[PDB]
Each structure stands twice: as C-alpha cells, then as structure tokens.
C-alpha cells in the first residue's frame, strides 16, 4: 500500500542512473523521454485507484523500455525494465489478491447508500423530538411504512441493529418517556424470523463465492506478456462486470420478497436458592461470634430457622398448566393432522371420516370452548386495536426495562409475527366447518391481551423487584476519585509524553507505573480503606515524585504540566429500631401480596378458566415491594443524615442489606418460577395456536 512511494523511489534512482548515463552522450531518444516518465511518476500521488499508478509506471516502463533496449548500449542498463516488470507482476500478484475477495467494495457502497437514508428517516423522526400517543401510533405506522418501504436485505440486519443503536443513542435523552419500550418491541418483532433471510442471504453469497471462485480460477499465471497481458485484464473485468451483474440478481431477491414464513409445527430454572448469609465475612463473623447493634428484641430474634424458612421458601414455591394443556392440545392437533395421512380412496372409506370428524369438531369446539372458557367470544372493540392497527397494536405492546424473559420476548416477537398473518388469516373456517376464522382472530387478540396485560404487570413487578434490588444493593472518597482520575490521564498523557522522547523515558516508565497507581486511582468503582488510604498516600508520594520528576529531569512543558497537577491536587436508634420492624412490616405485606396470590395462583389454579390464576398472577405482580421500599428509603433517608455509632452501623447496615437480599433470594424463587410459568404458557399458546392455524387451514 504505501510501498508505492518506495517503488517511486526507486523508479527515480534508477532514472536517475540512467539519466546520468544519457545526459551527455547524444541520441536525441532516451532522456527526455525518460526524464518525463520519472516526472510523471513523481506527481503522481494516487493510492486507492491502485492501477492509477500502476499504469503511471506502465508508461514509464515502456518509455524505458524503448530508452534501454534502443539505444545506449554502452549507457542504458536495461536491467530496471525488469526490475519494474518483476514489480508490475507483484502488482498483478496484489491485484490477485484482492480479486480473493472484492464483494466488500460495493456491499460497502450499497450499505453506504443504504444507512443514510435510515439516518435521514430517524433524523426527521428524532428531530421530531429533538427541535404524543397518538403520534406515537402515527409513529408507529410510520415505521411499519419504512420497513416495507426500506426493503433490503443485508441492510435489512443493519436496520434492525440501527433500530436498536438508535433507541440505546436516544435511551439517555430525556424527550420521550416509552420510546425505548416502543422501539424495543420494534427490533424485538423485527427479529421474530430474520434468521431466514440471513440464510437466504448466506445461500447467495455462496453462489456468489462459487461464482467468483470460478471467475478467479479463470485468472491463471500468466507471468510473461508485457505488451500483452491486457487480454487476461480485460478478460478478469468482462468476468467482473458480468459477475457484478450476476450478484445485483442475487441480491435483488428483495426482503419484502423475503418477507414470508410458515407454520407447520412447535415446541415449548423453577426454583433457584442462594445463601448470602456467609458473604459478608464480618457479618458472618457476627453469625459466626454487639448490644449497639443487638439492643433490643425486634421480635424477629432467629436467623438460622429464617434461612431454613428463606430455603424452604425456595423450595415449596414449585407449585405452566394453560401451558401443559396447550402441549396437550398441539400433541393431539398433530395427532388429528397424521389421522388423514392415507391415500385417496381407501382413507376417506372409514378413516378420514373420522379424521374430517374429529378436526371439523376440534375446530367448532375451539370457537365454543374459546368463547367459554377463557380468551373469550363476542368482544371484537380490542381486535381492532390489536389484530387491526396492528402499527399501532406493536407500538401498543408495552415492554418491560428489558434469560426465561428474553424466551418469552422472542416467543411473543414470533407469535405476532403469525398473529399478523393470523388476523390476515380472517375468512377461511368455512374450509374447517367461514366468519369463525375472524372470531378466532379476535379471540387470539383476545388472549394477546390478556398475555399484554400480564406482561405489563410483569414490568410492574420486575420494577417492584428492582428497587427491592437496588434497596438490597445500596450497600468518604466517593466522587473525590475525580481529581483521581484526572490526574490519570494526565499521567497517562505523561507516559506518552515520556514515550515521546527523541534515554531517561524509563524513569518516566517508572513514573507510568506510578501511574499504575493512578490506574488503581480509577479502580474499586474494611481493608479496601487502607487501599484507599494507602491511594492517597502514593499521590501524596507521587506530587512529591512529580517535583522530583520535573525537578531532576529539566521536563519543562511537564513542569508546567506538574505545576498544574499539584495545583489540582485538591437518640435516632430506638426510632430507627421502630422503623426497621415497621419495614419488616411494609416488606411482610410485600411477601404477603406476593406469597398468598402465589399460593392462589399456585394451589388453588384449578378454580379458574385462564381467568382466577391468571387473576393471581396479577396480584402477585401487584406485590407491595413499593410500601416495602417506602419504609425501606424512609429508614434509608434517617440513616443517611445520621450520626455514626459505630456499635450499630456498618455491620448491622450491611445486614439489613444482606436480609433484604435474602428476601429477595427467596422472591426471585417465587419469580422465577412465574417467569418460567408465563414464558412457557405464552410459547405453548403460540404453538397452539400455529396447529390451529394448520387445522384452519387444512
């Protein structure tokens, strides 16, 4: 690449060789000829083009060609034409290679062509909100209509990568309150299948690369030909111009093109326990051997009966069945589509019949029982915002902040990805025995709503389950590493100030493993206070070391660079008592909220038709972790302007933070296990679903 100024170089030692030889002997043929070969290789600059240059010294080697082997045969050396011939076949060889692989110039093209265009449609639609739910469904129709409009695969991937890259780039700015939630459904739904047009793309560029394999096994060792090896060129570029041609084909199989599926068939960590009773080493130290910090008796007084309790809490939560149901039905749904599986005549004697029989009756029975027990019939208002406005029913999907959650989102991304072609599927149980296949589309966007709902209440529970997190994990410097950090990048600065010398960068060196003490100046965000201790100790040694830095060595832009671095170196317990059992008061309704609609929900599932579980699960989710978190932060905010005595605080506050994760240990078993519930019940619903779709149609 930048060899080609060093074969300039030696293009003009050689002429200048040569012109030496030719500037006094009189021929009236090689010099000035030569002269301007040269010249024309010294202007010229080019890189990118790389037969720019490369046919600026085919001028020139034919110019020195007729200049050696003309005349001046005593004078002209001859050998430079075949140095610059052996060099004109190692820019045959390079042009070789880069014929290995060339499908990146114009796939970079057309993804430079591709990727404004989306920059200027979320330029007008940010700018939008840069310079309301409504708008959000105009918005929402308005992506629908770039999506079809912006058919191209490959930038397809892009796009969907840039409709998550710009939700994480506007994620931040304060213009929009569920835009993230929205467009989180977005790429969620828009990678439903996408994979299959990744293979379709990967099938193409195979072709393509059997193509050009083939085009470039065509281009053999010529090694010989100078005046002549054009043909092989122009051979190589009628190959290239009619493989380019042959790979727009191959990528015009456009992704609205590829913007079908199918569905034929699908399929479909209950309790988790964790002790962290042990990780404090001094609150276990504590559980292992103060009156400040065990004064009175707050009525709770056993710990190890309450981990047993928080285990078996664990434990018994395992008592999903909508979902075994559903499993039920698909396995029977196969079964009723293998019953007509014989031949023509002697099938439909007895058999299909039956076959007919039992799938006629699965479907009127799908209608009656999905009317009767459950995503129920003769409500049709939410179809229309659901499985009609279907722009505005994706931007109505409201999603959580966000493993079993992810399946359940791409379990939800693929399910409205058929229930699109499901309630374009209106019209056709005539064939299944005519106005109950639209029934079944408002009863699947019946039982979608009641799935959204749930979903909603999970975001309302997974928000309840992240302050309790963040109340469990908000366990003197702090913010006085600033300074800290700025000095390490002046020190880094100063290691490459050191490694920008042109003999004594080592004591610099030195001086940047000082600066592995301005690393650790950047690092741990009980004894980690004597590091910090120990931190502000080396930087008092270091600005000390920096006089005797700048001193020893003269360093004087460092001087001044030190001269500004050392210039930048700089009652309430019986109510708190009160309070913490009036939060294990407020964190006991949380568990009662969530433990008794989990044991109504759990125990007591059978007394309901997808309706009093479903019920409970909700009330579950309706847990009151945020009364637990108004007592928690009500003694958060009296400990925070508190004074420290410390025969209470420290420990005692690392325990109630390791308690309220101990509760939470044992709420992410109960959670977890309803997250297990509802993504196995929404993907067997969906699988249900695809074989009553196959029963509808067949």
């Not at 690393?519 to 965000?525: C, E, G, I, R, V």
């Not at 007394?607 to 958060?636: D, G, P, W």
Request: proline share 3%; glycine share 2%; aromatic share 10%.
């Amino acid at each position: 690449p930048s060899k080609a100024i060093e074969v300039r170089d030696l293009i003009k030692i050689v002429e200048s060789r040569a012109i030496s030889l030719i500037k006094n002997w009189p021929e009236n043929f090689v010099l000035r000829g030569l002269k301007d070969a040269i010249d024309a290789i010294l202007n010229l600059s080019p890189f990118s083009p790389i037969a720019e240059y490369l046919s600026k010294l085919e001028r020139v080697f034919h110019l020195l060609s007729e200049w050696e082997k003309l005349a001046s045969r005593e004078y002209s050396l001859a050998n430079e034409m075949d140095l610059i011939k052996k060099k004109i076949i190692d820019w045959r060889k390079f042009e070789l290679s880069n014929w290995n692989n060339l499908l990146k110039l114009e796939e970079y093209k057309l993804s430079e062509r591709v990727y404004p265009r989306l920059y200027s449609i979320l330029q007008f639609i940010i700018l939008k909100p840069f310079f309301f739910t409504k708008q959000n469904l105009c918005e929402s129709a308005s992506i629908i209509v770039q999506f079809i409009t912006d058919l191209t695969v490959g930038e397809f991937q892009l796009c969907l990568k840039c409709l998550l890259s710009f939700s994480q780039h506007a994620a931040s700015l304060r213009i929009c309150h569920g835009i993230d939630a929205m467009l989180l459904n977005i790429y969620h739904y828009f990678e439903q299948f996408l994979s299959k047009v990744s293979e379709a793309i990967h099938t193409q560029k195979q072709s393509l690369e059997n193509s050009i394999k083939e085009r470039i096994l065509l281009m053999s060792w010529k090694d010989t030909n100078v005046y002549a090896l054009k043909e092989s060129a122009k051979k190589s570029h009628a190959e290239l111009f009619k493989v380019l041609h042959r790979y727009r084909e191959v990528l015009r199989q456009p992704v609205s093109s590829y913007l079908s599926q199918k569905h034929d068939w699908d399929s479909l960590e209950n309790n988790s326990a964790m002790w962290v009773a042990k990780k404090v080493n001094l609150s276990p130290s504590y559980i292992e051997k103060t009156e400040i910090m065990k004064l009175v008796p707050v009525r709770f007084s056993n710990t190890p009966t309450t981990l047993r309790l928080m285990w078996t809490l664990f434990a018994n939560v395992e008592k999903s069945t909508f979902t075994n149901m559903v499993s039920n039905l698909i396995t029977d749904a196969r079964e009723l589509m293998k019953l007509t599986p014989e031949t023509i005549n002697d099938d439909n004697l007895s058999e299909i019949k039956h076959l007919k029989s039992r799938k006629h009756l699965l479907l009127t029975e799908t209608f009656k029982t999905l009317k009767a027990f459950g995503l129920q019939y003769r409500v049709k208002a939410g179809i229309e915002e659901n499985l009609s406005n279907l722009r505005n029913l994706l931007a109505v999907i409201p999603t959580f902040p966000v493993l079993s959650i992810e399946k359940v989102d791409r379990s939800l991304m693929k399910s409205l990805d058929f229930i699109p072609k499901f309630q374009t599927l209106a019209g056709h149980q005539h064939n299944d025995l005519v106005p109950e296949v639209q029934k079944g589309v408002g009863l699947f966007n019946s039982m979608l709503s009641l799935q959204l709902g749930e979903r909603a209440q999970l975001v309302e529970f997974t928000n309840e389950l992240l302050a309790l997190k963040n109340v469990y994990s908000e366990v003197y410097d702090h913010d006085f590493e600033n300074r800290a950090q700025a000095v390490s990048m002046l020190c880094q600065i100063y290691a490459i100030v050191i490694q920008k010398h042109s003999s004594f960068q080592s004591i610099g060196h030195e001086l940047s493993r000082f600066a592995d003490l301005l690393s650790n100046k950047l690092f741990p965000s009980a004894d980690k206070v004597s590091s910090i201790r120990d931190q502000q100790k080396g930087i008092n040694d270091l600005i000390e070391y920096c006089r005797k830095k700048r001193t020893e060595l003269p360093e004087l832009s460092y001087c001044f660079k030190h001269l500004v671095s050392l210039q930048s170196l700089k009652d309430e317990f019986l109510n708190l008592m009160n309070f913490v059992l009036n939060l294990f008061d407020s964190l006991l309704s949380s568990i009662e909220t969530a433990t008794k609609n989990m044991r109504t929900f759990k125990e007591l599932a059978e007394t309901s038709s997808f309706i009093e579980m479903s019920s409970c699960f909700s009330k579950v989710l309706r847990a009151f972790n945020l009364k637990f978190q108004s007592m928690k932060l009500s003694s958060l905010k009296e400990k925070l302007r508190s004074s420290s005595v410390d025969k209470m605080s420290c420990q005692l506050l690392m325990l109630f933070l390791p308690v309220c994760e101990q509760f939470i240990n044992l709420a992410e078993s109960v959670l977890d296990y309803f997250i297990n519930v509802h993504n196995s019940n929404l993907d067997s619903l969906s699988k249900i679903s695809t074989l009553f779709f196959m029963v509808a149609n067949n």
